[PDB]
Design an enzyme around this catalytic site. Structure first.
Site, PDB file in Angstrom:
ATOM      1  N   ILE A  21      37.809  10.664  31.301  1.00  0.00           N
ATOM      2  CA  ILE A  21      38.635  10.653  32.515  1.00  0.00           C
ATOM      3  C   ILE A  21      38.768  12.098  33.017  1.00  0.00           C
ATOM      4  O   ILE A  21      38.405  12.388  34.158  1.00  0.00           O
ATOM      5  CB  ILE A  21      40.023   9.964  32.316  1.00  0.00           C
ATOM      6  CG1 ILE A  21      39.866   8.453  32.031  1.00  0.00           C
ATOM      7  CG2 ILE A  21      40.944  10.200  33.540  1.00  0.00           C
ATOM      8  CD1 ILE A  21      41.121   7.771  31.453  1.00  0.00           C
ATOM      9  N   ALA A  25      43.972  22.115  28.937  1.00  0.00           N
ATOM     10  CA  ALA A  25      43.990  23.075  27.825  1.00  0.00           C
ATOM     11  C   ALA A  25      44.707  22.481  26.607  1.00  0.00           C
ATOM     12  O   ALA A  25      44.383  22.833  25.470  1.00  0.00           O
ATOM     13  CB  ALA A  25      44.669  24.367  28.252  1.00  0.00           C
ATOM     14  N   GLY A  27      44.588  19.218  25.605  1.00  0.00           N
ATOM     15  CA  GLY A  27      43.986  17.920  25.289  1.00  0.00           C
ATOM     16  C   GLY A  27      42.972  17.301  26.234  1.00  0.00           C
ATOM     17  O   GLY A  27      42.903  17.662  27.411  1.00  0.00           O
ATOM     18  N   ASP A 139      58.418  19.985  34.948  1.00  0.00           N
ATOM     19  CA  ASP A 139      57.055  20.303  35.395  1.00  0.00           C
ATOM     20  C   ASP A 139      56.522  19.208  36.344  1.00  0.00           C
ATOM     21  O   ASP A 139      55.360  18.789  36.267  1.00  0.00           O
ATOM     22  CB  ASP A 139      56.094  20.562  34.213  1.00  0.00           C
ATOM     23  CG  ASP A 139      54.867  21.385  34.590  1.00  0.00           C
ATOM     24  OD1 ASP A 139      53.900  21.385  33.819  1.00  0.00           O
ATOM     25  OD2 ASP A 139      54.876  22.017  35.673  1.00  0.00           O
TER      26      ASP A 139
HETATM   27  O1  LIG Z   1      49.377  12.959  29.248  1.00  0.00           O
HETATM   28  C1  LIG Z   1      48.682  12.836  30.258  1.00  0.00           C
HETATM   29  N1  LIG Z   1      48.506  13.830  31.144  1.00  0.00           N
HETATM   30  C2  LIG Z   1      48.861  15.215  30.847  1.00  0.00           C
HETATM   31  C3  LIG Z   1      48.779  16.040  32.125  1.00  0.00           C
HETATM   32  O2  LIG Z   1      49.457  15.411  33.201  1.00  0.00           O
HETATM   33  C4  LIG Z   1      47.930  15.861  29.843  1.00  0.00           C
HETATM   34  C5  LIG Z   1      48.374  16.911  29.054  1.00  0.00           C
HETATM   35  C6  LIG Z   1      47.476  17.677  28.329  1.00  0.00           C
HETATM   36  C7  LIG Z   1      46.126  17.401  28.383  1.00  0.00           C
HETATM   37  C8  LIG Z   1      45.679  16.326  29.116  1.00  0.00           C
HETATM   38  C9  LIG Z   1      46.576  15.551  29.832  1.00  0.00           C
HETATM   39  C10 LIG Z   1      47.999  11.546  30.568  1.00  0.00           C
HETATM   40  C11 LIG Z   1      47.220  11.183  31.646  1.00  0.00           C
HETATM   41  C12 LIG Z   1      46.905   9.798  31.490  1.00  0.00           C
HETATM   42  C13 LIG Z   1      46.092   8.985  32.292  1.00  0.00           C
HETATM   43  N2  LIG Z   1      46.043   7.648  32.096  1.00  0.00           N
HETATM   44  N3  LIG Z   1      45.199   7.012  32.953  1.00  0.00           N
HETATM   45  C14 LIG Z   1      44.664   7.963  33.705  1.00  0.00           C
HETATM   46  C15 LIG Z   1      45.137   9.240  33.374  1.00  0.00           C
HETATM   47  C16 LIG Z   1      44.643  10.473  34.042  1.00  0.00           C
HETATM   48  C17 LIG Z   1      44.468  10.507  35.422  1.00  0.00           C
HETATM   49  C18 LIG Z   1      44.019  11.663  36.042  1.00  0.00           C
HETATM   50  C19 LIG Z   1      43.758  12.797  35.290  1.00  0.00           C
HETATM   51  C20 LIG Z   1      43.933  12.788  33.912  1.00  0.00           C
HETATM   52  C21 LIG Z   1      43.761  14.040  33.105  1.00  0.00           C
HETATM   53  F1  LIG Z   1      44.859  14.402  32.495  1.00  0.00           F
HETATM   54  F2  LIG Z   1      42.851  13.929  32.148  1.00  0.00           F
HETATM   55  F3  LIG Z   1      43.406  15.092  33.823  1.00  0.00           F
HETATM   56  C22 LIG Z   1      44.356  11.613  33.293  1.00  0.00           C
HETATM   57  C23 LIG Z   1      47.486   9.437  30.290  1.00  0.00           C
HETATM   58  N4  LIG Z   1      48.152  10.478  29.717  1.00  0.00           N
END
Ligand SMILES: O=C(N[C@H](CO)c1ccccc1)c1cc(-c2[nH]ncc2-c2cccc(C(F)(F)F)c2)c[nH]1
Length: 343
Positions: A21, A25, A27, A139
């Site tokens: 997806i 930084a 995860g 945030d």
């Molecule tokens: O926890 C989530 N997002 C936060 C940041 O906002 C996060 C923190 C650190 C590293 C990566 C991500 C998170 C996103 C999602 C999610 N579920 N379905 C789609 C998404 C999604 C949608 C757009 C972008 C992303 C991302 F975070 F990978 F960029 C994820 C689930 N948990």
């Protein structure tokens, strides 16, 4: 184990058929098929144990999201990690699968007034529950707002979230801050630690303005530039609002600036609904004490089509010292908090 973009992503046997997806930084996020519930989920791989900051953000989020249950707040469905502290290097957090985020949407899509109204309603509905638990998100920004194909909105990333502490909010002028610059309230740069509910309302105000024009309203290029963008639009603070700022360095900085008049919201957003601009003005109020609160925001005429306080639930109990804790101790607390998901 299954591999995604040259990185290990072992979530089997329960979760299979991975698809990348996006990244961060703190995860990597993949979509996966849940073989128990027969539905596709989102999985976030975090590797935090070598950095104290990463550990703190991981624990805050896990603790809060396991206690929270709301339609406009991302949940934690499952947590994958090794059976022992010794073997635990990565933690996989299973969450709601959504189509996109508001940051990605605003880059290519013009929002109708009905979409702005519905997105704002859902943001404030989720925020009401967070604030009722005595928690601050700290945030809020378009990338921390997820959307599915039917426009359901869910607030995510509680890595910087804290328990509200209004008694210990005062600090000196230009005090270092961690949360995303463009969504920072003016008092952050002047005399606030960001320990009050008003900090989140400012960020929501910034998000509303961005939904109206597809551009961040205050795109500061550095720490103090952020305050000058805010003052460039709001104009010089009133005598009453200045007298609320007791710190001499912060007050004299504001006093040193030449007089600047308010840029009217209808000049910045000529196609916007007048009720949306009245609510925007109330959220983007310079004085945090005069700033609209989440329940008032929901009761504003702009959200009349959706407002129903009986269908805007609050937390069953309030939520309640992780800053001065070693990363090895934080690892122990992360292990203990994720124990309920082990077979
Ligand atoms: O926890 C989530 N997002 C936060 C940041 O906002 C996060 C923190 C650190 C590293 C990566 C991500 C998170 C996103 C999602 C999610 N579920 N379905 C789609 C998404 C999604 C949608 C757009 C972008 C992303 C991302 F975070 F990978 F960029 C994820 C689930 N948990």
């Amino acid at each position: 184990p299954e591999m995604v973009r040259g990185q290990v992503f072992d979530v089997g046997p329960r979760y299979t058929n991975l698809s990348y997806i996006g990244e961060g930084a703190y995860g990597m996020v993949c979509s996966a098929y849940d073989n128990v519930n027969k539905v596709r989920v989102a999985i976030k791989k975090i590797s935090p144990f070598e950095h104290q900051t990463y550990c703190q953000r991981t624990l805050r989020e896990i603790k809060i999201l396991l206690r929270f249950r709301h339609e406009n707040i991302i949940g934690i469905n499952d947590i994958i990690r090794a059976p022992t502290i010794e073997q635990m290097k990565d933690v996989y957090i299973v969450q709601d699968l959504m189509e996109t985020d508001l940051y990605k949407l605003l880059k290519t899509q013009h929002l109708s007034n009905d979409h702005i109204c519905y997105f704002l309603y859902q943001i404030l509905r989720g925020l009401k529950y967070i604030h009722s638990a005595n928690v601050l998100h700290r945030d809020l920004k378009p990338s921390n707002l997820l959307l599915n194909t039917t426009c359901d909105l869910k607030i995510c990333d509680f890595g910087l979230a804290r328990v509200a502490d209004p008694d210990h909010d005062h600090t000196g002028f230009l005090t270092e801050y961690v949360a995303t610059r463009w969504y920072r309230a003016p008092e952050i740069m002047l005399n606030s630690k960001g320990y009050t509910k008003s900090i989140d309302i400012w960020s929501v105000g910034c998000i509303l303005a961005e939904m109206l024009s597809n551009r961040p309203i205050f795109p500061g290029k550095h720490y103090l530039d952020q305050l000058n963008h805010i003052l460039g639009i709001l104009g010089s603070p009133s005598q009453e609002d200045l007298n609320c700022i007791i710190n001499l360095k912060a007050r004299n900085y504001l006093l040193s600036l030449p007089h600047k008049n308010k840029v009217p919201w209808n000049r910045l957003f000529p196609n916007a609904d007048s009720k949306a601009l009245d609510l925007l003005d109330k959220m983007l109020t310079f004085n945090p004490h005069k700033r609209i609160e989440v329940e008032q925001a929901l009761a504003h005429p702009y959200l009349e089509q959706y407002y129903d306080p009986s269908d805007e639930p609050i937390a069953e109990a309030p939520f309640k010292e992780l800053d001065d804790l070693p990363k090895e101790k934080l690892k122990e607390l992360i292990f203990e908090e994720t124990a309920r998901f082990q077979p």
